[PDB]
Amino acid sequence: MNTVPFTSAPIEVTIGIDQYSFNVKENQPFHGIKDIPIGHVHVIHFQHADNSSMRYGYWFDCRMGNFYIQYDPKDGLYKMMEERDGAKFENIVHNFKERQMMVSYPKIDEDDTWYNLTEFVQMDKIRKIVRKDENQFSYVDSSMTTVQENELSDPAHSLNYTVINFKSREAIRPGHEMEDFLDKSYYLNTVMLQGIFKNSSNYFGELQFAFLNAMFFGNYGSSLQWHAMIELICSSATVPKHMLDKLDEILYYQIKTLPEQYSDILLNERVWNICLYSSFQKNSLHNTEKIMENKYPELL
Amino acid sequence: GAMNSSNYAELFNNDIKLFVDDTNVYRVTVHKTFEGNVATKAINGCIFTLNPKTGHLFLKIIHTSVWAGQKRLSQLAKWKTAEEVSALVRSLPKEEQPKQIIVTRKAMLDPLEVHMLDFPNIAIRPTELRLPFSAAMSIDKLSDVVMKATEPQMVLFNIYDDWLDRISSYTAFSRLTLLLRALKTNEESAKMILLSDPTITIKSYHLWPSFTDEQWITIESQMRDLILTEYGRKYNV
Numbered sequence A: 001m002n003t004v005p006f007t008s009a010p011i012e013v014t015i016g017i018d019q020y021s022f023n024v025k026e027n028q029p030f031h032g033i034k035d036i037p038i039g040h041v042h043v044i045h046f047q048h049a050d051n052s053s054m055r056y057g058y059w060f061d062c063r064m065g066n067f068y069i070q071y072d073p074k075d076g077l078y079k080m081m082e083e084r085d086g087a088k089f090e091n092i093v094h095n096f097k098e099r100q101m102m103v104s105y106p107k108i109d110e111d112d113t114w115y116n117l118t119e120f121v122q123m124d125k126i127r128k129i130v131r132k133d134e135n136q137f138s139y140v141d142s143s144m145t146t147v148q149e150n151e152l153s154d155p156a157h158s159l160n161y162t163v164i165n166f167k168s169r170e171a172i173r174p175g176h177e178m179e180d181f182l183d184k185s186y187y188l189n190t191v192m193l194q195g196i197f198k199n200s201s202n203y204f205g206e207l208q209f210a211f212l213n214a215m216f217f218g219n220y221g222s223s224l225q226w227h228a229m230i231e232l233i234c235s236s237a238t239v240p241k242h243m244l245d246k247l248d249e250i251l252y253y254q255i256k257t258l259p260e261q262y263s264d265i266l267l268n269e270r271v272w273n274i275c276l277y278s279s280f281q282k283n284s285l286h287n288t289e290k291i292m293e294n295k296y297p298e299l300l
Numbered sequence B: 001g002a003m004n005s006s007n008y009a010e011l012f013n014n015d016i017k018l019f020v021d022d023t024n025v026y027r028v029t030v031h032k033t034f035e036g037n038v039a040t041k042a043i044n045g046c047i048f049t050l051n052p053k054t055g056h057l058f059l060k061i062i063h064t065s066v067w068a069g070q071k072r073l074s075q076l077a078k079w080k081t082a083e084e085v086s087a088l089v090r091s092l093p094k095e096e097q098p099k100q101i102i103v104t105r106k107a108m109l110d111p112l113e114v115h116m117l118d119f120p121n122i123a124i125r126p127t128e129l130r131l132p133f134s135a136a137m138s139i140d141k142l143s144d145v146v147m148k149a150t151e152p153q154m155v156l157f158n159i160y161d162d163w164l165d166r167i168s169s170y171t172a173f174s175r176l177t178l179l180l181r182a183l184k185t186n187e188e189s190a191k192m193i194l195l196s197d198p199t200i201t202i203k204s205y206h207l208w209p210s211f212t213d214e215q216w217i218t219i220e221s222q223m224r225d226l227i228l229t230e231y232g233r234k235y236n237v
């Protein structure tokens, strides 16, 4: 069990850690988060009380270093940092733990929600989507645009998700125009899976990461990517049976976790109605279709 | 964006453009089988691709053999249309290729866009206009060449005859659309109007009769009456 200590909390802020969140009052006795489960990526995220504009946060994996948060009063945000002096970091955390100034990652034993949402998400791939190589953790916020969004403006601050475009030469083989547009299997299996992602695990990892950035930061380009990656599978007549079964599990837990009152802005009516009721895989997503129909029957 | 009444003069500027109408590509007769079921029988069709500034009509004849053994023919017809329009553009010299292709039905947009990915600078546009190009198969010489075809064939027609010698392409298009609307609203009346006087003939190399300017005014007036007439006969006004 690892710890993301905080030097202090000088401004009032709602802090999230994965799917949990709590309020910290200005100058309240806060020194961080303990008992963080090892083996998963995690995200620690922030919304200031005085400006709900800009949710922002950091993806990290405690196996890759010792990380702490300190408020920067010049740039006006909580920043993650890496302490290289292991001896000093472990020593400081112990004093904070002794003073009972750290909140406990509040995981119920029965509960596999976080695993299920991050099963295929690896830090190494996050860092290729979010490029800032001098750090072991990755900053994301509500406003960051995607590379594809920038083709339709600061490159160093972009989300380099894999570009998916159904009306592109990459997606459409010469002489198979109708076939490839109406049945996207070539684009899914040859171009994307064999060619770019190499395997379905990396595809699902990017899909899961896009969903989580959409949900936690309201990142619009990430929501676009999530839906595009769903639609590419659902619009393919030929998908490996294990990928369909896994997709149904992935989406089930995403829909289960989605806050009810954010569905209107995080769910695309066309994609979901097409995926569940018109597409080749309209009958392959039993768990997802059942939770969608019982939780969001208006959208459909 | 979309082409409509407000931006109508754009049709006659000097940017090459084509209208594509797919209405008459997939044509069937519906009939009873011996068992009393219903079946379709295809007949030859055509793509109507028109340069509205010059009157150049590229009439690609769609022979019924292209449907043999194929499924979902109404959907295939849109993709076949887009394949043939794409082939036509590729066949033209660069300086003759269109800068815009306007499709008369919105369901042609995605098929044509996909077939034209190699031409990212050619705009594919819809229209809000209800253009009467379906009635091209009521022009006798066009109908004849489509029905006589035994194989796929491209036939070339100037749909304005020699009108541009005497009128502008705005006025020619307006005449064409009036004639075709009339033929679509009441084919028999419209054809009676056009061919009632045996002394005005259709030249061998033309589609329409050789009316004088004065006779065209009368003709156009009679076509407007007809479209009002039938509009009352239909709506009881």
Ligand SMILES: NNC(=O)CSc1ccccc1F
Binding pocket: A005, A006, A007, A068, A069, A083, A088, A089, A090, A092, A093
């Ligand atoms: N200049 N930065 C530091 O002196 C703080 S490093 C640190 C180490 C362990 C626990 C918490 C911490 F904030």
Ligand SMILES: NNC(=O)CSc1ccccc1F
Binding pocket: B055, B056, B057, B058, B156, B157, B158
């Ligand atoms: N009969 N026509 C010609 O000999 C060439 S002019 C032309 C060119 C393309 C389509 C329609 C046309 F009338």
